[PDB]
RNA sequence: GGUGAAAUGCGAAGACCCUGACUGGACGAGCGGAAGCGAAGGCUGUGCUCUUGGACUAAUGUUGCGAUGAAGGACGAAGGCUAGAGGAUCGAAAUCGAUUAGAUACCGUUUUAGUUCUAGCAGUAAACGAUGCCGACUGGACGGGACAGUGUGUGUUGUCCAUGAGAAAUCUUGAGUAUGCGGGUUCUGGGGAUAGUAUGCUCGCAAGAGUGAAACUUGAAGAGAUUGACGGAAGGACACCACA
């Protein structure tokens, strides 16, 4: 109590609890509760539409070697006493992201848009680092500038022949198996050996759902 | 005093500047003192109580890396870097990126 | 309560040389463990505990 | 952090009060919680020095927190708090001099302290002075342990019931 | 059980202990060490972060919360970005009151091309 | 919130903190280095386009068309000035609050010109490797960057050791090649201070830049290194006239 006693001038019990449910692709569909302040009688609950939450991929699908990835959902409907989410994004956790950048190596990055089947638009960011072969004795491992411009062209083609006009139910299937990070690492390693190729992040620019 | 003249710059005119992390003064990037560290996200005198609190059967505590950047006055005062004798001034220490683990 | 017998004297590291680091060896189930004590300890001594879950280093 | 000293109770035929600016108290260290195990005396003629060399009244080194702690007395500047008065005397202009605070909220303001690093939590005693409603001054009024001061101006009774001293943050 | 999130901001001054929903849009408790002391110098010390994480413990522990996912931060931006002293002592005080622990993360704000900050060409000469 | 610690100042018309949407200027982190490019000043997001350089590789063309360079010309950090546009952050000047013997200062609060873009003027820097340009000749060791070959070569470049040089500190494609003194061709200095000041002239909207004295004064001013004394300097040992 920093201030003197007077110088400058139960509602929790009358609240509600709902349940957040994610898309049925992942086994673990139920992910927690969410409150709601009952503003008025017959309160329009369009104040609860637009909220946004994330869950770790090691919790949607019980498994431990994929706990470095997240999915981000956005509320879009209420059914009784239960909320529903829609796919909204994806990212890596900041501690795992930092561990891929290395002193004395090159970092290549690209980005691109795609269009789903219903018309929703997404931006996709991709990543990669150079690799040392098994008899390396120099201090640096750097690619020439004209050869990063060739690997970047390849990254634009892999992004758009897999993630293109196609339903959103399977765009969440190949973002969970690392399908895009594995094509980049063989088509691209014929110009220079690479490592740590992955999708870095996904944004929603304009959704329909 | 030094054959560097105090900074690692060769065969270029200008080299870009930064603002010090403690006082905020403007310095060349090749002259600043730079340090890298990896710290655990949770303190080490707290690991036992965290093994009974966890709900998952397998947990890894995270680690983050931090690069710092100071000026000559702020690194000398903070004892990040000390006065050396005439001959010991010439010793450089590195990292060796080809170490096995 | 529990017990343990000191078997190595690592060093004296206190604010003013007050505490002394040590390496105990619990006896109800053998487990080396680090620990900081306060009195004049020697080797072979057996100290008490009332909870064995910290290592201090 | 500034503190204020007050006198409370119901006043009967009183006009003003004033301490002599020297009294014991009890402190305790911020950042620690540990309290000082003695009662220190905070006079106004004492001298000291802080960390930057400023001139304070008292200086203590907090044992746990391991720093210096300072206290010093302010004077209740004379334009808004003390409101100079006079009193009677012999036939030529003696007119004894006194300063007396104002009874704002059923209590009188008597002192003001400025503190760094420490914190006052109580005050033990003082030297009280009473001023009658008209002109007579009682000095060193021996207050009871039962908290009722009382003195007589040869006929009448000026007295204070429910007497106590407090310390409020300002 | 029932899980909530704990946003914990800890800098050189004044740790925060703020507990919210899973969406993050509904507050269940919010007590900052700094409304536990009377000296401005000690709003951000480890003793005031323990007085603050004990009130938040008893309150939400009766409001039904059982599990906590953490999100830590410094000050980021053009300010110094590293956790302060009263960070680690608010986490250890909630783990003992009885709560369990989920995921842990660091969410400090990162300037990727900043603005100019205080001091000038010579810095703050104290 | 910020401080060694606080004060002015902001907060119940709901601050700070957590969340859904937007707007605007500026900037281009990490990767980022004794790595690259440009005449120098300088230049780090991605994709297009118009322009540019040096090296390398070769039985291509030409045939001495070259080196240096008072006078002349173009470019040139930051601040400043003239017009329009713009306005996030920071911030001279002004202003209060502290500190102080006093602070028109260091530290802080309120608040500006400026900081950005387009079109120009101006012409200065510890514009520094404090290190003219071109040509001949000269030991080792460990590297980098480009091209070409195949176990090496040419152009560039970083570190470390001799010989040699130097007043020394130090220098290694030069600060080496003998007072054993001459390869071609320029500029600048001639004890200190007066003083880059007066005056004339040329240029500029101005602020100023370029060129540039004397009377009078005076025995040293200066470079590099040696041993001491001192530091509101850093370490390593110690001591119940130090702590625990
Ligand atoms: Zn600094």
Swiss-Prot record, chain A:
The organism of origin for this protein: Encephalitozoon cuniculi (strain GB-M1)
Pfam families assigned to the protein according to its UniProt record, in alphabetical order: Ribosomal_S3Ae
Protein name: Small ribosomal subunit protein eS1
Gene Ontology biological process terms from the UniProt entry: translation
InterPro entries: Ribosomal_eS1, Ribosomal_eS1_euk
Keyword terms, alphabetized: Cytoplasm, Ribonucleoprotein, Ribosomal protein
Subcellular localization(s) per the UniProt record: Cytoplasm
GO cellular component, one term: cytosolic small ribosomal subunit
Subunit structure: Component of the small ribosomal subunit. Mature ribosomes consist of a small (40S) and a large (60S) subunit. The 40S subunit contains about 33 different proteins and 1 molecule of RNA (18S). The 60S subunit contains about 49 different proteins and 3 molecules of RNA (25S, 5.8S and 5S).
UniProtKB/Swiss-Prot annotation, chain B:
Protein's cellular compartments: Cytoplasm
Transit peptide keyword on record: no
Keyword Ribonucleoprotein annotated: yes
GO molecular function: mRNA binding; structural constituent of ribosome
Record-stated family: Belongs to the eukaryotic ribosomal protein eS26 family.
Quaternary structure note: Component of the small ribosomal subunit.
Protein name in UniProt: Small ribosomal subunit protein eS26
Originating species: Encephalitozoon cuniculi (strain GB-M1)
From Swiss-Prot, chain D:
The protein's name: Uncharacterized protein ECU01_0250
Classification via InterPro entries: CXXC_Zn-binding_euk (IPR008584)
Pfam families: CXXC_Zn-b_euk
UniProtKB/Swiss-Prot annotation, chain E:
SUPFAM superfamilies: Translational machinery components
Pfam family, one: Ribosomal_S11
GO molecular function annotations of the record: structural constituent of ribosome
Record GO cellular component, one term: ribosome
GO biological process, one term: translation
InterPro entries membership: Ribosomal_uS11 (IPR001971), Ribosomal_uS11_sf (IPR036967)
Keywords associated with the record: Cytoplasm, Ribonucleoprotein, Ribosomal protein
Main location: cytoplasm
Compartment annotation: Cytoplasm
Quaternary structure and partners: Component of the small ribosomal subunit.
Family: Belongs to the universal ribosomal protein uS11 family.
Protein's name in the database: Small ribosomal subunit protein uS11
Species: Encephalitozoon cuniculi (strain GB-M1)
């Amino acid at each position: 109590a920093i201030q003197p006693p007077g110088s400058y001038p139960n509602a929790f019990a009358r609240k509600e609890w709902y349940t957040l449910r994610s898309p049925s692709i992942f086994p673990n569909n139920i992910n927690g509760k969410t409150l709601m302040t009952k503003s008025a009688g017959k309160n329009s609950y369009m104040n609860m539409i637009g909220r946004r939450y994330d869950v770790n991929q090691a919790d949607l699908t019980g498994n431990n070697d994929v706990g470095h990835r997240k999915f981000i959902f956005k509320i879009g409907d209420i059914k009784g006493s239960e909320c529903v989410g829609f796919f909204d994004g994806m990212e890596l956790t900041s501690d795992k992201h930092k561990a891929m950048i290395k002193k004395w190596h090159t970092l290549i990055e690209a980005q691109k848009d795609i269009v789903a089947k219903d018309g929703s638009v997404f931006r996709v960011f991709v990543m990669g680092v150079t690799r040392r072969h098994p008899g390396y004795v120099k201090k640096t491992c750097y690619v020439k500038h004209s050869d990063e411009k060739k690997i970047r062209k390849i990254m634009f083609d892999v992004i758009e022949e897999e993630l293109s006009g196609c339903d959103v139910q399977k765009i969440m299937k190949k973002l969970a198996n690392e399908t895009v990070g594995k094509r980049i690492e063989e088509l691209g390693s014929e110009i220079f050996p690479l490592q740590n190729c992955c999708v870095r992040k996904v944004k929603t620019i304009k959704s329909h759902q | 005093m030094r054959r560097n003249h105090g900074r690692g710059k060769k065969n270029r005119g200008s080299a870009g500047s930064i603002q010090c992390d403690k006082c905020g003064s403007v310095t060349p990037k090749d002259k600043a003192i730079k340090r890298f560290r990896i710290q655990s996200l949770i303190e080490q005198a707290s690991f036992d109580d965290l093994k009974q609190a966890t709900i998952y059967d397998v947990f890894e505590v995270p680690r983050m890396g931090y690069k710092s950047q100071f000026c000559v006055s702020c690194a000398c005062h903070a004892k990040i870097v000390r006065v050396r004798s005439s001959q010991a001034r010439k010793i450089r220490y590195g990292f060796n990126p080809n170490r096995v683990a | 309560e529990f017990f343990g017998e000191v078997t190595h004297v690592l060093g004296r590291t206190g604010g003013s040389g007050l505490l002394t680091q040590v390496k105990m060896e619990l006896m109800h189930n053998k487990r080396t463990i680090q620990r900081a004590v306060k009195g004049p300890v020697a080797v072979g001594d057996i100290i008490e505990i009332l909870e064995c879950e910290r290592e201090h280093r | 952090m500034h503190f204020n000293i007050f006198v409370e109770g119901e006043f009967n035929n009183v006009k003003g009060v004033f301490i002599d600016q020297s009294y014991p108290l009890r402190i305790q260290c911020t950042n620690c919680g540990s309290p000082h195990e003695k009662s220190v005396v905070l006079s106004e003629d004492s001298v000291g020095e802080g960390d930057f060399g400023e001139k304070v009244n008292l200086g203590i080194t907090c044992r746990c927190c391991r720093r210096i702690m300072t206290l010093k007395i302010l004077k209740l500047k004379e334009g808004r708090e003390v409101k100079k008065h006079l009193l009677p005397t012999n036939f030529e202009d003696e007119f004894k001099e006194v300063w007396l605070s104002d009874m704002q909220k059923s209590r009188f303001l008597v002192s003001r302290i400025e503190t760094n690093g420490a914190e006052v939590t109580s005050i033990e005693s003082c030297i009280l002075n009473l001023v009658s409603n008209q002109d007579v001054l009682f000095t060193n009024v021996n207050f009871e342990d039962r908290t009722v001061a009382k003195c007589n101006n040869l006929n009448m009774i000026s007295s204070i019931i429910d007497f106590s001293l407090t310390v409020e943050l300002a | 059980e029932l899980a909530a999130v704990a946003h914990i901001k800890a800098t050189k001054n004044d740790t925060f202990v703020h507990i919210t929903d899973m969406t993050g849009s509904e507050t269940i408790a919010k007590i900052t060490g700094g409304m536990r002391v009377k000296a401005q110098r000690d709003e951000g010390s480890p003793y005031a972060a323990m007085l603050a994480a004990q009130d938040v413990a008893t309150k939400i522990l009766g409001r039904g919360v059982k599990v906590l996912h953490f999100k830590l931060r410094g000050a980021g931006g053009v300010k110094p970005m590293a956790l302060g002293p009263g960070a680690q002592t608010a986490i250890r005080t909630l783990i003992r009151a009885g709560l369990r622990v989920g995921r842990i993360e660091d969410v400090t704000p990162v300037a990727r091309d900043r603005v100019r900050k205080r001091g000038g060409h010579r810095g703050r000469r104290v």
